[PDB]
Amino acid sequence: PGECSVNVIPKKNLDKAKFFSGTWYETHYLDMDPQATEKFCFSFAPRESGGTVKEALYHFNVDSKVSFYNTGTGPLESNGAKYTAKFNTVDKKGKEIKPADEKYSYTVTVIEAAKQSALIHICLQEDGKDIGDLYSVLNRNKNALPNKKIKKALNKVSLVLTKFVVTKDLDCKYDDKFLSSWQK
Ligand code: HEM
């Protein structure tokens, strides 16, 4: 069973306006499938209004040199640092090229945020059942190292940063304009 991790604790009192703004780059990631060894880069632009999150997602497969673009939309939980979204597929210009498949969703939890850093966890689900999960360290700057608060959050749940894949040395290609222009 590709079971999602337990003990994923949403940050208490996340500053919403701060987190749900601008562009976040993944700097480190830990796919919980040890055989998922394809190198990836990721960036996203999450926005929130009225209790609904609308975000633009960008992945880049370093192995295959193929990128894919998604948008996700879903309700923010009352705790303010977790949301479950449905997603579609779009092209670089924002047009839908594949509609949302109802049977798929994902759940994002913001575990910690400090200064220019954040730590999130994503659980992918098919029909409300776990199909896989990933932790990611985020930063406003592609090359930056995480704040110590991020490490403390990882240690609370027996993870260490060395187990994460480090992005900065890979041949990432980003579409920063797709994200910068999100909702403009
Ligand atoms: C907010 C954070 C993230 C969200 C919401 C997210 C969302 C998604 C979604 C919806 C898919 C499925 C796309 C599809 O099958 O059509 C996907 C696939 C995938 N994502 Fe993420 N992702 C996030 C972060 C990351 C990060 C940080 C990495 C690694 C650096 C990553 C690696 C992957 C991989 C390896 C796949 C499988 C792609 C394939 O089938 O070729 N994701 N992600």
Judge whether 59 and 72 are in contact, CB under 8 Å: no
* Rounded to 5°, angle at Cα 60 from 55 and 66: 120
Radius of gyration of the chain (CA): 15
DSSP summary character for residue 43: E
Question: What CATH number was assigned to the domain covering residues 1-184?
Answer: 2.40.128.20
Judge whether 121 and 115 are in contact, CB under 8 Å: no
| Tokens linked to 171 | 């041949």
Identify the CA nearest to 111 among candidates 6, 5, 12, 3. Answer: 12
Residues flanking ligand 1, CB < 6 Å:
26, 29, 36, 38, 40, 42, 44, 57, 59, 70, 72, 87, 89, 106, 108, 120, 122, 134, 136
Is 28 annotated in some ligand binding site? no
| Tokens linked to 151 | 């490490």
Resolution (A): 1.8
| Residue length of the chain | 184
Q: What's the CA gap between 8 and 177, in Å, rounded? A: 32
Q: What's the CA gap between 67 and 4, in Å, rounded? A: 25
Task: Report long-range pairs for 94-101 (Cβ below 8 Å, ≥24 apart).
Answer: 94/178, 94/181
Tally of CB atoms within 10 A around 161: 15
Through-space distance between the first and last CA atoms of the chain, rounded to whole angstroms: 41
Q: What's the CA gap between 138 and 19, in Å, rounded? A: 11
Distance 33 CA to ligand 1 centre (A): 13
Residues 6+ apart with CB under 8 A from 43: 23, 24, 25, 26, 58, 174, 176, 179
What is the enclosing helix (H) or strand (E) of 21? none
Distance 91 CA to ligand 1 centre (A): 16
Is 121 annotated in some ligand binding site? no
Q: Experimental technique used?
A: X-ray
Q: Is 87 left (phi over 0), alpha (psi -120 to 50) or beta?
A: beta
DSSP code string of 110-131: EEEEETTEEEEEEEEEETTEEE
Q: What's the CA gap between 7 and 21, in Å, rounded? A: 26
